[PDB]
Amino acid sequence: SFKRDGDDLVYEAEIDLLTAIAGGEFALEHVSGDWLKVGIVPGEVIAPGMRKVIEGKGMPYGNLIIKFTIKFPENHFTSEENLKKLEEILPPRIVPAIPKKATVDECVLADFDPA
Amino acid sequence: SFKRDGDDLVYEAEIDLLTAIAGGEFALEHVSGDWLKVGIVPGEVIAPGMRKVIEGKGMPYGNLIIKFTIKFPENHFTSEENLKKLEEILPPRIVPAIPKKATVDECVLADFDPA
Incomplete structure (x- = not known):
């Protein structure tokens, strides 16, 4: 439509x-x-x-x-070796710049349930 | 926030x-x-x-x-050669299945100017 x-x-x-x-x-x-x-x-x-x-x-x-x-x-659409190869094809990565002396909580991502 | x-x-x-x-x-x-x-x-x-x-x-x-x-x-973030490498890392492509005998108009994509 x-x-x-x-x-x-x-x-x-x-x-x-x-x-x-x-x-x-x-x-x-x-x-x-x-x-x-x-x-x-x-x-x-x-x-x-x-x-x-x-x-x-x-x-x-x-x-x-x-x-x-x-x-x-x-998820898991390819092998780890290929995922590594993506790093050479795609632009440079962006990594976090956490303030020194800040308290940091290492967290894990969990799936979201639609409802 | x-x-x-x-x-x-x-x-x-x-x-x-x-x-x-x-x-x-x-x-x-x-x-x-x-x-x-x-x-x-x-x-x-x-x-x-x-x-x-x-x-x-x-x-x-x-x-x-x-x-x-x-x-x-x-655009143009990597070499043509590298783009072809993506073909082997990402899943199989999806291509058009146009009805035969159908009228086909080959089109080009132009940029969208917000104004």
Whole structure:
């Protein structure tokens, strides 16, 4: 389903993380019935909630705005060796700078129950 | 700041993609003045908008709920060659299955200007 905002249409697309950061393709059926085949160029990253525009695919023409949702892999989707390799592909890590002499509580993350 | 949810507290934490999918650590000052040092175990993925619980760090005690936002790298953050390496670390890609005989419009993505 598409939402109408003035003369523009808004569509919420979901793509996998790989395509989001390494490029790929996705498609969707337009309200006209034609299918739009979209290519995400390697190098042009799609971030969570980011918006992009498809020129002239709106209403009498306006544009089509795609709002992206990125699906992440589940736990243990790869080996530890590969996870180490990610450190060489992705940008430098950000580590905490805890004030010296502050009291620190080493905590663990527990799963959140929807209800 | 922290939002009070009855007996629990809610904190909006932002981490880089690297830590989100490969593990690492982050810290935050608690309402008590104490600093919480959190370790994200390699293999335990954090997804956009995902919530996690730090038990006992709530209100007189309840729990602390952390809602994560994942910061993504800008465009051209690595070599084309490295992007292809991602293909072997992340799960299989999802590609378009467009109905044959359907009208197909090859589209390009343009930036979304807030103004």
